[PDB]
Amino acid sequence: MASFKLATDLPEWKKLEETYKSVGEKFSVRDAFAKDPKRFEEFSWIYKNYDDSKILFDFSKNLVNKEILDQLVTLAKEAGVEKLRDAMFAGDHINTTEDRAVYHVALRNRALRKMPVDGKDTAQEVDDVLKHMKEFSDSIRDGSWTGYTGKSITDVVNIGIGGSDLGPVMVTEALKAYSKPGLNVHFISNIDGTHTAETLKNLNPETTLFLIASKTFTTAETITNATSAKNWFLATAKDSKHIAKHFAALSTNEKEVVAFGIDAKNMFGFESWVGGRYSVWSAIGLSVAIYIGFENFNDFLKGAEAMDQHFLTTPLENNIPVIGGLLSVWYNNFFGAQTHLVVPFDQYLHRFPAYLQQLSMESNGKSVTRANVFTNYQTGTILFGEPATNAQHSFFQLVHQGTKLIPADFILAAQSHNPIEKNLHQRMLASNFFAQSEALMVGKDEAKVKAEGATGGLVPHKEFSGNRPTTSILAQKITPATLGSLIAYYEHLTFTEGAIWNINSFDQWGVELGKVLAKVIGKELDDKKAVATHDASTNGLINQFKEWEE
Amino acid sequence: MASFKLATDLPEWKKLEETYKSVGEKFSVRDAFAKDPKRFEEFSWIYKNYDDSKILFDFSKNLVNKEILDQLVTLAKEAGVEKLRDAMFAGDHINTTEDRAVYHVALRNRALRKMPVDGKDTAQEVDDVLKHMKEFSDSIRDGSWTGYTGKSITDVVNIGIGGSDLGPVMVTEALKAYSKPGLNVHFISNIDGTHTAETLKNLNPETTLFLIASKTFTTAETITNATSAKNWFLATAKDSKHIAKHFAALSTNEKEVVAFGIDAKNMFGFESWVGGRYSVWSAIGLSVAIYIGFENFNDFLKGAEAMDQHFLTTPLENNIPVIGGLLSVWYNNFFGAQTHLVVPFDQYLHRFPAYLQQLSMESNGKSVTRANVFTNYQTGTILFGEPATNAQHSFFQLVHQGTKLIPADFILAAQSHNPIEKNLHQRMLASNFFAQSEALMVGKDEAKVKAEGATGGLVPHKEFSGNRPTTSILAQKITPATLGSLIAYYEHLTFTEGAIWNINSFDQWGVELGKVLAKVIGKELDDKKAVATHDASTNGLINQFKEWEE
Ligand SMILES: O=C(O)[C@@H](O)[C@H](O)[C@H](O)COP(=O)(O)O
Ligand SMILES: O=C(O)[C@@H](O)[C@H](O)[C@H](O)COP(=O)(O)O
Ligand SMILES: CNCC[C@H](O)c1cccs1
Ligand SMILES: CNCC[C@H](O)c1cccs1
Ligand SMILES: OC[C@H]1CC[C@H](CO)CC1
Ligand SMILES: OC[C@H]1CC[C@H](CO)CC1
Ligand SMILES: [Cl-]
Ligand SMILES: [Cl-]
């Protein structure tokens, strides 16, 4: 139970509103650098990972100074961010609406610290699943697990949706440099039959392995997809005994897995206290272990663990995910910026924004606090993004010259996995990273536009305001460990935001509703009659569909 | 030159502010349907395509009624939307800042209407490029254009970025059902050397054709990529005489193409008046014509042409792209919603939101009007999305239960290209389409939550406000023609928004800045000394990079 009801009840909230009007609204980043020669040092932090690799988190181009950050830290203290964090790590049931622990941090407890739920350590139970994952993924990779005709597996198809899909997708794409030729992964997720048809069309049943990924093992889309995949498999295999070499399950529900025809020995389990959008660290990450090997997957976990330790043990004023979360609150609640842009200067990370979009928005898109009252202040932001340099050629127009503040995170690795042409591409990429954040800060004034040759009415069109904020995140290399730390950064940022707003970051009563009105209409689409059971728009759309369907 | 300075000073703007306060803010969509039994008919329009196929645009779950829509139409008349549209179609130089025509509509002039720029008809000149495109794409597909060892082309690699990349990507993905076995397309765009390395590593130089897609033929990323691709090609082919069978260009700049080593005969041309984000209809679409055949590409153009005719000839109150644009203004400028969500219930259309994100934000992210003064009101929204059903399990939590208004467009085809399992998947997909928009409108009140079994503090967490607006777009089938119409709808919606805001939707001075910013720093990355020529953050980031680079 909550120590306060509303974020607006915390004394520092009004003080921040007043600082916004006196200092924040008209904040000049150019002036801040001129006032404070040490600003880069003061507003950048080096994170050291467990493997002694490093990531620089530079917040110094944000609309923040010492006064503002000190106030945000006081707000975090008033909100009990540390109390809630500590309860999370203690295994307390801080998912109050589902009455569940929130223990993705236990999934990556590779040190085997005591991490109890309901007074019982989880360290060994988690480790045992990882050992099963190692054994199975090793046998897929070395050919000792063969298909029904005695061939090594060449293609692994994950079937799942939401938290049972997007993490596997994003992480296999991100760490594809660590894959091996001849072993491919695929991801079926949409119920749209296109997804199944296009994915399976050119695969060989004899050498394809399915992972059916579902926490509940009841999700409409996933079980239907999995059934259609089984039918494809059997169209060639022509005997149900062959299923056992070709289908495994990633779930919390052993009874429903067995009911589907998968042997319990090929179920990779996890617990209720793993949220889908926090699940890639669990059995749900099996596709990643198969694609890049268990040891790389373990390194990914250890990266998360090291960031967890940083979050747990660091005073707020130097705690990197907390700082990111405080700046998000600053922009969301005081500037009224509705969005948060994440731009990886990295093609492997092309699905990173999409993954973070689920993490962030599904966590923090809430209107009710832990005191069970409605928020009349803003909660979760809308997170979006695409990789650079492409984004620079497209919606960066609006980032630079539009009327909306869009706080932005830019991410670059100093070293490429693909340093082709003697690192020419990489140097060009990095130059863009530095130059874009610089430009967003410094802008281009009327005098400069004139000096560059514009006259008369053209001039204002070529001006740039500057003072457009960015956070720059520079890693040495996007290894498994680094990616693990980067995701955990955003997990704990998300945590911080939710703690300040006093929401439950860990339920999802909208995604849960997502299965009820659809079943009602599904049955109406199976009947022949025109429908009149809904509002006129829903009826009209259904009836028009009925006239146009096959 | 403009007939007004600022949208806020059009007479109807202050009237719409008063209507927002009195009727708009607290608008009840449920009450609207109860008051008007004909609401679905009054606020939905069937669009008829040139091939007699249809698309239903249902706006009736929006926060709009006759009073509001009539005021928005008056606003459009005061802003001179029709006069600017007519000037666009006349070939006038409405891109005032670059002194260019805006003539993507001429690209899809299959009717060969008189469409002049600078007083000279473009119809035959456009048509002649399309004839070249047909000839070449036919020759790729029929194996008469062979590689340097006499083999059919199997892989076509477009190299380009932004406007020269995202349309080809999105449309080849969208129309993949119309492709043929054994002829694949790929898209290199990022400067990041990963993009080139991963795309080329398993292709055969003997059967790979490159299209270098660049309006200017000077873009740094594209020319660098193209050079690296030529190096890869020559590593196997050895003799540069073989380049003529493997490299073609899509460009306005013949001199630079020929300087690169591409024969002028293998340039597919277009003109200055094609903006990149409006360019897939031009030579830039050659990869589409190769992948799906010229006839399908031509059908795509004819769908756009039909929607152009609708936009040109329809009174504002019944003009479908104008209505969409008026609603956008309503939400952006009166409700203060910063975002616009686009969700295709269609996996083929997975890259459709990203394409629209460029179209929309790059067009309308501006702060200066055609009277060359700064705005005192919001312009372009932030457009985002992913396909459903994935999105329902990603971020729809926030759409349903968060604190932000997010106008959403949902798109479904009645018929799938892949009606597997006797259309089971398709019926399930459709059910979701109808149910999600219904749910966003109806919500779920406190009493219903109690009736469903929640007590005490759990109750508010399970409430849904409803009155969350959607637009539903139901097509018969996403054919080439349908997709052409759909993109043109969003082009003309974008046009409408910009016309009301009095901005130039057709320049992109932030994208142009980005293309000259990186070279300065690139030269500093080539020296190995530490740098102190910038602000302390930019210096700090460059210097840390230098410490960490290979
Ligand atoms: O975030 C969520 O809870 C949803 O995306 C789930 O992750 C998705 O609905 C799949 O649920 P399950 O894993 O139970 O099949
Ligand atoms: O929208 C734009 O203008 C950009 O995205 C361009 O398409 C991109 O910069 C590539 O330009 P070009 O086609 O001249 O290579
Ligand atoms: C072989 N599978 C064992 C699964 C294990 O019992 C579980 C772990 C977590 C939930 S269920
Ligand atoms: C064979 N290529 C000719 C290209 C033609 O001249 C052009 C058309 C549009 C711009 S340039
Ligand atoms: O073309 C591949 C497709 C896969 C799913 C089956 C399901 O019956 C149909 C064939
Ligand atoms: O591995 C494929 C890669 C492609 C680009 C060339 C550029 O030199 C290097 C090899
Ligand atoms: Cl297990
Ligand atoms: Cl041509």
- Residue written as token pair 């293609």: A155
- What was the experiment behind these coordinates? X-ray
What is the spatial distance between Cα B221 and Cα A432, in angstroms, rounded to a whole number? 11
The reported resolution of this PDB entry, expressed in Å, is 1.4
B77, B11 in Cβ contact below 8 A? no
DSSP count for chain B of H helices, then E strands: 21, 13
- Kindly give the distance from the C-alpha atom of residue A145 to the centroid of ligand 1, in angstroms, as a whole number: 29
- Find all residues with CB under 8 Å of B202, minimum gap 6, and list them: none
The token duo for A134 is: 């190692």
What is the spatial distance between Cα B95 and Cα A268, in angstroms, rounded to a whole number? 59
- 3-state class (DSSP) for residue A259: helix
- Kindly give the distance from the C-alpha atom of residue B413 to the centroid of ligand 1, in angstroms, as a whole number: 25
Beta bridge partners of B45: B57
- Is B71 annotated as a binding-site member? no
The answer to whether the peptide bond before residue A533 is cis (omega within 30 degrees of 0) is: no
Does any ligand 5 atom lie closer than 6 A to the CB of residue A231?
yes
Q: Give the residue among A490, A77, A487, A493 at the shortest CA–CA distance from A322.
A: A493
- Find all residues with CB under 8 Å of B341, minimum gap 6, and list them: B383, B384, B385, B399, B406, B407, B408, B409
Q: H helices within B475-535, ranges in order?
A: 480-501, 509-526
Bin B124: left if φ > 0, else alpha if -120 < ψ < 50, else beta.
Answer: alpha
Contacts within 8 Å (CB) and 24+ apart, B99-106: B100/B272, B100/B273, B100/B506, B101/B272, B101/B273, B102/B273, B102/B275, B102/B278, B102/B506, B103/B271, B103/B273, B103/B274, B104/B274, B104/B275, B104/B278, B104/B279, B104/B281, B104/B282, B104/B491, B105/B308, B106/B273
The answer to whether the peptide bond before residue A389 is cis (omega within 30 degrees of 0) is: yes
Catalytic pick from A120, A238, A241, A393? A393
- Between strands A184-188 and A247-251, the pairing is unpaired
**What value, to the nearest 5°, has the Cα angle with vertex B398 and ends B396 and B402?**
150
Query: Is B491 labeled as catalytic in the residue annotation?
Result: no
Does any ligand 3 atom lie closer than 6 A to the CB of residue A188?
no
The token duo for A340 is: 């948060």
Beta bridge partners of B121: B116
B315, B359 in Cβ contact below 8 A? no
Which sign does the torsion angle of CA A28, A34, A39, A41 carry? positive
Q: How far is B122 from chain A (nearest CA, A)?
A: 28
- Find all residues with CB under 8 Å of A395, minimum gap 6, and list them: A386, B357, B358, B361, B362, B365, B382, B383
Q: Is A530 on the interface with B (CB under 8 A)?
A: no
- What angle, 0 to 180 degrees and rounded to 10, lies between the N-to-C axes of helices B220-237 and B193-200? 30
Nearest Cα residue to atom 7 of ligand 4: B269
Q: What atom of ligand 2 comes closest to residue B284's alpha carbon?
A: 13
The token duo for B274 is: 């094609």
Q: Which of A194, A200, A203 to mutate to test the pocket of ligand 5 (most atoms within 8 A of CB)?
A: A200
- Find all residues with CB under 8 Å of B335, minimum gap 6, and list them: B20, B24, B25, B63, B405
B510, A397 in Cβ contact below 8 A? yes
Q: Do B538 and A428 touch (CB under 8 A)?
A: no
What is the spatial distance between Cα A423 and Cα A417, in angstroms, rounded to a whole number? 10
Q: Do A537 and B368 touch (CB under 8 A)?
A: no
Named by the residue before each, gaps in chain B exceeding 2.5 A from C to N are none
- Between strands A267-269 and A339-344, the pairing is unpaired
Q: Give the residue among B61, B78, B62 at the shortest CA–CA distance from B16.
A: B78
Q: What atom of ligand 3 comes closest to residue A252's alpha carbon?
A: 10
Beta bridge partners of B100: B95
- Residue written as token pair 């994935």: B390
Full DSSP string of B259-311? HHT--GGGEEE--TTS-GGG-TTSGGGHHHHHHH-HHHHHHHHHHHHHHHHHH
- 3-state class (DSSP) for residue A57: strand
- The A184-188 sheet, strands edge to edge: A184-188, A155-159, A208-213, A247-251, A267-269
What is the spatial distance between Cα B134 and Cα B299, in angstroms, rounded to a whole number? 13
- What angle, 0 to 180 degrees and rounded to 10, lies between the N-to-C axes of helices A294-313 and A81-89? 140
- Find all residues with CB under 8 Å of B368, minimum gap 6, and list them: A460, A461, A463, B374, B375, B503, B504
HEC secondary structure over A422-473: HHHHHHHHHHHHHHHHHHHHHCECHHHHHHCCCCCCHHHHCCECCCCCEEEE
Does any ligand 6 atom lie closer than 6 A to the CB of residue B208?
no
Sequence letter at residue A163? G
What is the spatial distance between Cα A42 and Cα A20, in angstroms, rounded to a whole number? 21
What is the spatial distance between Cα A379 and Cα B407, in angstroms, rounded to a whole number? 17
Query: Is B93 labeled as catalytic in the residue annotation?
Result: no
What is the spatial distance between Cα B189 and Cα B165, in angstroms, rounded to a whole number? 7
Q: What Å distances lie between residue B202 and A426, B149, B155, CA to CA?
A: 22, 18, 11
What is the spatial distance between Cα A56 and Cα A473, in angstroms, rounded to a whole number? 6
CB atoms within 10 A of CB A476: 19
Query: Is A362 labeled as catalytic in the residue annotation?
Result: yes
Bin A187: left if φ > 0, else alpha if -120 < ψ < 50, else beta.
Answer: beta
- Which residue in B has a C-alpha nearest to residue A459's C-alpha? B372
User: Phi then psi for A111, rounded to 5 degrees?
Assistant: -70, -15
Q: How far apart are the first and last CA of chain B?
A: 54
Nearest Cα residue to atom 7 of ligand 3: A269
The token duo for B22 is: 């009195």
The token duo for B42 is: 């009054």
- Find all residues with CB under 8 Å of B224, minimum gap 6, and list them: A424, A425, A428, B191
What structural domains does chain A harbor?
7-79+314-505 (3.40.50.10490), 120-295 (3.40.50.10490), 516-548 (1.10.1390)
Q: H helices within A249-364, ranges in order?
A: 254-259, 286-292, 294-313, 320-329, 352-364
The token duo for B476 is: 């018969």
What is the spatial distance between Cα B13 and Cα B228, in angstroms, rounded to a whole number? 54
- Find all residues with CB under 8 Å of B453, minimum gap 6, and list them: none
Mutate which: A58, A98, A189, A192, vs B, most B CBs within 10 A: A192
- 3-state class (DSSP) for residue A207: helix
The token duo for B445 is: 């009140």
- Is B358 annotated as a binding-site member? yes
Q: What Å distances lie between residue B387 and A195, A346, B344, B393, B399, CA to CA?
A: 11, 23, 5, 11, 14
- Find all residues with CB under 8 Å of A356, minimum gap 6, and list them: A342, A383, A385, A490
Return the H-helix or E-strand segment holding B54: strand B54-58
Alpha-carbon A40 to chain mean position? 28
A476 contacts in B (CB within 8 Å)? 548
What is the spatial distance between Cα B289 and Cα B297, in angstroms, rounded to a whole number? 5
With DSSP H G I counted as helix, E B as strand and the rest as coil, what are the percentages for chain B, rounded to 5?
55, 15, 35
Q: How far apart are the first and last CA of chain A?
A: 54
Catalytic pick from A14, A21, A35, A515? A515
B432 contacts in A (CB within 8 Å)? 191, 514, 518
Strand ranges for B365-508 from DSSP E: 382-384, 408-413, 470-475
Q: Give the residue among A369, A367, A363, A496 at the shortest CA–CA distance from A5.
A: A369
Sequence letter at residue A39? R
Q: Give the residue among A354, A173, A355 at the shortest CA–CA distance from B353.
A: A354
Give me the residues of B, 226-245, that contact A with CB < 8 A: 228, 231
What is the spatial distance between Cα A171 and Cα A176, in angstroms, rounded to a whole number? 8
**Length of chain B in terms of residues written:** 550
User: Phi then psi for A109, rounded to 5 degrees?
Assistant: -80, 65
Q: Give the residue among B461, B394, B397 at the shortest CA–CA distance from A277.
A: B394
Q: Give the residue among B25, B31, B29 at the shortest CA–CA distance from B62.
A: B29
A404 contacts in B (CB within 8 Å)? 338, 378, 380, 382
Does any ligand 2 atom lie closer than 6 A to the CB of residue B246?
no
Q: Is B530 on the interface with A (CB under 8 A)?
A: no
Sequence letter at residue A472? S
A329, A24 in Cβ contact below 8 A? no
Strand ranges for B289-422 from DSSP E: 339-344, 382-384, 408-413
Sequence letter at residue B300? F
Indicate the residue of A60, A196, A403 with minimum beta-carbon distance to B367.
A403
Does any ligand 1 atom lie closer than 6 A to the CB of residue A161?
yes
Does any ligand 1 atom lie closer than 6 A to the CB of residue A162?
yes
- 3-state class (DSSP) for residue B471: strand
The token duo for A246 is: 């070709």
What is the spatial distance between Cα B489 and Cα B307, in angstroms, rounded to a whole number? 7
Q: Give the residue among A418, A158, A460 at the shortest CA–CA distance from B200.
A: A418
Q: Is A107 on the interface with B (CB under 8 A)?
A: no
Q: Using CB atoms within 10 A of its CB, is residue A227 exposed (0-12), middle (13-18) or buried (19+)?
A: middle
Q: Is B313 on the interface with A (CB under 8 A)?
A: no
- Residue written as token pair 């898209």: B187
